[PDB]
Amino acid sequence: YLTIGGQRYQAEINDLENLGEMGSGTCGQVWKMRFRKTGHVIAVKQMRRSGNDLDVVLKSHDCPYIVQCFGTFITNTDVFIAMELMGTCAEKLKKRMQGPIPERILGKMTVAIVKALYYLKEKHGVIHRDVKPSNILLDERGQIKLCDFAGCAAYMAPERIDPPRADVWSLGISLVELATGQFPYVLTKVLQEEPPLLPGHMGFSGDFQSFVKDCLTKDHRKRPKYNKLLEHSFIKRYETLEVDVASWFKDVMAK
């Protein structure tokens, strides 16, 4: 069963017409396919099986900040998940640009991601727990979204190794990484050094640096629930402020 347009259908993956391969987000190998049945175009990500999910994204179409899932397939080998078509990963842009990302894009981006985080926690009681530039997608439309729920664990909360809210950490690091264009720092600095706040004098909004810091607060307990973050000024500015993200994106890509 594949559901698009608010109606639910079956559904065989061989069913779908295939067009070219698509890559550079997460790999995936991720495909561009069109569903003969409604005429739509979508993305299919393919994975080899292991020993021996994920309904939820399929079950959250009322969030405009999470990339939508159309359904799934299983076979002996793979395992397919189908989702809406998009342009890239944040992280790719980072690498693609060499240069950093304007506080504005991050500002809108930041808003969108926090709202994604909020939705799942309350609506589905989920904790995404993998917030990184890989997991953030941007489009020609200029939309910003999340999926889903050289170190992978570099975004790890300082808490979350010692004592026997994280994401916010991860968020903070992404911003710092994306904002500055350099990864923010194995590990061992994470639990040892100073939280890597936004550069003191890089041209960064006062509002911003507070966000980035407030996220990065070392003691988790003091750390912000998503709810506060939403009220916070940076967030506030950006629900409102008008940013032509798409011409930027659409524009960054020539290069």
86 carries a ligand binding annotation: no
7 carries a ligand binding annotation: no
Please indicate the experimental technique that yielded this structure.
X-ray
**CA angle at 159 for the pair 220 and 175, rounded to the nearest 5°:** 75
Assess contact for 216 and 172: CB atoms under 8 A: yes
CA distance 217 to 172: 9
Token readout for 40 is 């739509």
24 carries a ligand binding annotation: yes
CA distance 111 to 208: 12
DSSP string, the chain: -EEETTEEE---TTTSEEEEEE-SSS-S-EEEEE-TTT--EEEEEE---------GGGG--S-TTB--EEEEE--SS--EEEE----EEHHHHHHHHSS---HHHHHHHHHHHHHHHHHIIIII-------SGGGEEE-SS--EEE-----GGGG--STTTS---HHHHHHHHHHHHHHHTS------STTTS---PPPTTSS--HHHHHHHHHHT-SSTTTSPPHHHHHHSHHHHHHHHS---HHHHHHHHT--
Q: Give the resolution value in Å.
A: 3.1
CA distance 72 to 49: 14
Candidates 161, 175, 164; CA nearest to 216 is 175
- Name the residue with tokens 């609506």: 123
Assess contact for 179 and 100: CB atoms under 8 A: yes
28 carries a ligand binding annotation: yes
168 carries a ligand binding annotation: no
23 carries a ligand binding annotation: yes
Q: Which residues are catalytic?
A: 130
45 carries a ligand binding annotation: yes
Domains of the chain: 1-86 (3.30.200.20), 87-255 (1.10.510.10)
